[PDB]
Each structure stands twice: as C-alpha cells, then as structure tokens.
Ligand binder design. Structure first.
Ligand SMILES: CC(C)=CCC/C(C)=C/CSP(=O)(O)OP(=O)(O)O
Ligand SMILES: [Mg+2]
Lengths: 296, 5
C-alpha cells in the first residue's frame, strides 16, 4: 500500500496535537480537520503547540509544523495547496497578494533555509487565520521585497541583517493579511560586547534580564502589531518561572508542558511593556516535539 | 525547537 517508509507513524503526530486539544478544551473549528490531514502526510518535522493568553482568556488553537528536510520547493507547494483547499469554503476569502509579491519572478528556492505552515483558530470564523513562514539567507532581491512589504522606516531597515531572515505571513479567513519580519541575534552575538551595549540603547534592563537563559533573541516587526514583540528562546523550560512572573491562566499552559515529552526548549513572546510590569498578563507560550525517522 | 536556523 505505502511506498515511503518511516519509523514515525502519522498517529504519533496526531496524538501530540490531540493531547493539546484535550488539555485546552479545543472543539472542532474550521479548518482544523483539514490541517490534521495535512500534518499526517508530512515526512520528518517538528510540531509546535502554543497558547496565547490575554488576561483571563486563553486562545490555544495554535499549531505550527516545521518541515525538517531540504525539499523546499515541495514543502512550499504542499503548504500553499493547504491554503487553497481551506479557501474553497464559499464564505472564506484569503488575500494571498502579499505572498504572491514575495514569491514572484524566478524565485530562488536554493536560498530558502526553513519553512513552517500553521493555524491560529478562533470561535469567530473571520478572526481565525492561517500561517506560512519562510526563512531566507543571502538573497538581496527578496530581502528587499520583504522589507518593503513590512513598511518600516529607512532607519529600521538598516538594522536588519543580511545573512538570514525569518519571515511570517498571516492570512485571516475574512480577507485581511499581514507580513512580519523577525530579526534575531544568537547567544554568541548578544554577548559580543559591541552588540550588548548597543542593545542597552534600545531596550530596557527589564527586557534584557532574561538573556542569560536564552540561546536566541528576536523582535517581531509587523504593520499588524500594536507594538514590537520580544521573542526569547529559552534553553531550559525549567528556568522559565524564575524569570517570567506569568498569571494563572498562562501557568495552566506552562504547567502542562512541564510534564509532556518533547523538547526541553520553549519560546515566550510578549511586548516590552509586559516585561516592565509586576505580573505578565499578555503572553504567548510555545512548546514542541520532534518527529524524525530513525531508519538510516 | 521550531523557527530556528
Ligand atoms: C526567529 C524569531 C526571533 C522569532 C520566531 C519565533 C516564533 C515563536 C514565531 C511565531 S509568533 P506569531 O506567529 O507572530 O504569533 P501571533 O502574532 O499570531 O501572536
Ligand atoms: Mg505575529
């Protein structure tokens, strides 16, 4: 029946998503079933589950799938097929023009470094969105196009790096869309001495306090954001609560993932204003598990 | 461990 073999069964990937749905009371929202049938068709991947917390409200129908192989053309085209199947519902409209602009011409797929596809679903259809992420490196023409779609000043444009850039696309089911750029610094960089004292001129000490816990730090820039979003990639999930005083709603998500098998790393995302507050009430939390075939 | 280079 099957042609390609893997030590990973599709059921293992769907169980990880199912544990998340059971833990956070997720009932079917469109197009979650279509997304799970797409997940089941992938090869090696990382699956990332997330919660967004706003005061006492939890939005937990957030899943990203990262392709772990190098078949970039294939993985972008299967992800887009998922977007177009979702859009076939007559009362769903997706505006793909921003992605079309980014991929126009003779796009150089050998410059792609990373791809993810994902969802963030809500009870109101029009507030739900689909997601595509593409990381590129050393690709001047398309880094220029991404910067132009993001609509940032020439000052800020100058501060983005040229070797690598993570780029996200959001498609709401009522036709709204946005791009986000995520410039970043690795541990070796944000401890380089020219770099850090420069960081101290744009960010508060509160924002800098968690850096010893992290191996990656970044900032999300998007026309859709009300303020820049800070991103921290912690090396150890068990260090999180000592440095991030989150509220009880966020604590339910974190306490669950402290006991799930998977990665020991974690992302947290929040505005700088939240880092200066006594208690964090508005925060996103991300946890993941890898699915890699063991047959050599 | 998603989204990294
Ligand atoms: C490469 C860097 C610095 C950050 C990317 C890490 C990451 C966890 C990204 C997705 S957060 P996002 O999809 O932007 O979440 P929402 O706006 O939908 O709240
Ligand atoms: Mg965003």
């Amino acid at each position: 029946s099957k042609v390609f073999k893997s030590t990973i069964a599709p059921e293992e990937k769907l169980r990880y998503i199912g544990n998340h749905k059971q833990a956070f009371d997720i009932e079917p929202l469109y197009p979650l079933a279509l997304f799970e049938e797409f997940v089941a068709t992938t090869g090696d991947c990382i699956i990332e589950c997330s919660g967004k917390i706003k005061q006492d409200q939890l939005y937990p129908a957030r899943i990203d799938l990262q392709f772990s192989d190098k078949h970039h053309f294939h993985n972008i085209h299967t992800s887009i097929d998922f977007l177009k199947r979702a859009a076939s519902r007559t009362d769903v409209n997706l505006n793909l023009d921003i992605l079309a602009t980014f991929l126009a011409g003779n796009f150089d797929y050998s410059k792609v470094q990373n791809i993810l596809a994902g969802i963030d679903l809500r009870q109101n259809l029009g507030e739900s969105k689909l997601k595509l992420f593409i990381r590129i490196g050393d690709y001047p023409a398309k880094m220029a196009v991404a910067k132009h779609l993001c609509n940032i000043t020439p000052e800020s444009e100058a501060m983005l790096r040229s070797d690598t850039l993570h780029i996200g696309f959001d498609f709401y089911l009522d036709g709204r869309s946005a791009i986000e750029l995520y410039p970043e610094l690795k541990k070796d960089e944000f401890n380089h001495p020219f770099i850090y004292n420069q960081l101290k001129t744009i960010l508060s000490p509160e924002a800098l306090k968690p850096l010893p816990l992290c191996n990656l730090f970044g900032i999300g820039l998007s026309p859709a954001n009300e303020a820049n979003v800070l991103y921290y990639h912690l090396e150890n999930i068990e260090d999180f609560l000592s440095y991030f005083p989150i509220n009880d709603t966020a604590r339910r998500v974190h306490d669950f993932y402290l006991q799930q098998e998977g990665s020991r790393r974690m992302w947290v995302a929040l505005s700088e204003s939240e880092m200066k507050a006594g208690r964090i009430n508005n925060v996103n939390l991300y946890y993941s598990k890898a699915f890699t075939s063991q047959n050599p | 461990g998603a989204h990294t280079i």
